[PDB]
Amino acid sequence: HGKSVTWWDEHLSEENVPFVKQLVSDENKAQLASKLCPLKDEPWPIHPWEPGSSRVGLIALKLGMMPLWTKDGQKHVVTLLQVQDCHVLKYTPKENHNGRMAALTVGGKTVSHFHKSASILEFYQELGLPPKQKVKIFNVTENAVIKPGTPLYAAHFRPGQYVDVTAKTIGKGF
């Protein structure tokens, strides 16, 4: 059985391709709107802040660079990080991840369903959210765990704070 390769645009007609695109776009819009109110569906208990606690991060999109002047006359340069779609995907317990701190998995910008693998699509189907591009793991303490499927916003960081930025640098090749 020498089966050939098949993509989603091969066996569709000129009339059904826009229908499929719309049927995916509206489902993604509805799924993103469903999670827009996480605190009223079934929030996990919120624990009080402890001095030895750690917090979850985000996955943003680097827009560009801008100047920014300070009240003392100095000029700094800021980089623009846009939080498009951050959702908690899965939660790994402390003893099953590291034994010291739990892990929360965070997804990034939305991508298309037609170019992801079967297992990834099954995971996002069970989760109820459209697939994400970059999926990362954040090491958090046991008192800062959040239910998976919770959205995160750029106001998670407040004006005046120090953050750490991880990314793949510009690859200059060999």
Binding site: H11, L12, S13, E14, E15, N16, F19, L23, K172
Partner: protein, 153 residues
């Protein structure tokens, strides 16, 4: 490091590349459908798209006049460009050219070859890849989905 580059290297340099693209564009304007290497046709696609836009600015436009004079090496094609191609591309915005990859050349080089063609030409239609009919199993199931969606509203 070739980050953010749109023009590929062809010929003996920038000027030779421009001359090669100019010859290809002259041939395309004269014959309404030509074939070359895939890279050359890919690069010529944008220039052919822009030539129709320039011709749509009108005959009296001096900038378009000199552009056509430079590009169309055969001077009998400039009236053709301004009075056949431009008038027939009026309602279309950017659908002026069609590019299709043809099988490799029968010569020993086995180059990757493409064919570019101005739409609406007086030539036999190419074997375009046609999509499946709606009467197929999968497309018919999709039509059922569409009918249910329409009935749901």
């Amino acid at each position: 490091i070739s980050h953010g580059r749109v023009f590929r290297r062809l010929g003996l340099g920038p000027e030779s590349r421009i001359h090669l693209l100019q010859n290809l564009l002259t041939g395309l304007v004269r014959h309404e459908r030509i074939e070359a290497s895939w890279a050359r046709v890919d690069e010529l696609r944008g220039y052919a798209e822009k030539l129709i836009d320039y011709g749509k600015l009108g005959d009296t436009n001096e900038r378009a006049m000199r552009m056509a004079d430079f590009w169309l090496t055969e001077k009998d094609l400039i009236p053709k460009l301004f009075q056949v191609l431009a008038p027939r591309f009026q309602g279309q915005n950017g659908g002026y050219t069609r590019m299709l990859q043809i099988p490799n050349r029968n010569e020993q080089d086995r180059a990757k070859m493409a064919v570019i063609e101005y739409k609406g030409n007086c030539l036999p239609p190419l074997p375009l890849p046609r999509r499946d009919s709606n009467l197929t199993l999968l497309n018919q199931l999709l039509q059922g989905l569409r009918q249910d969606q329409e009935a749901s509203s």
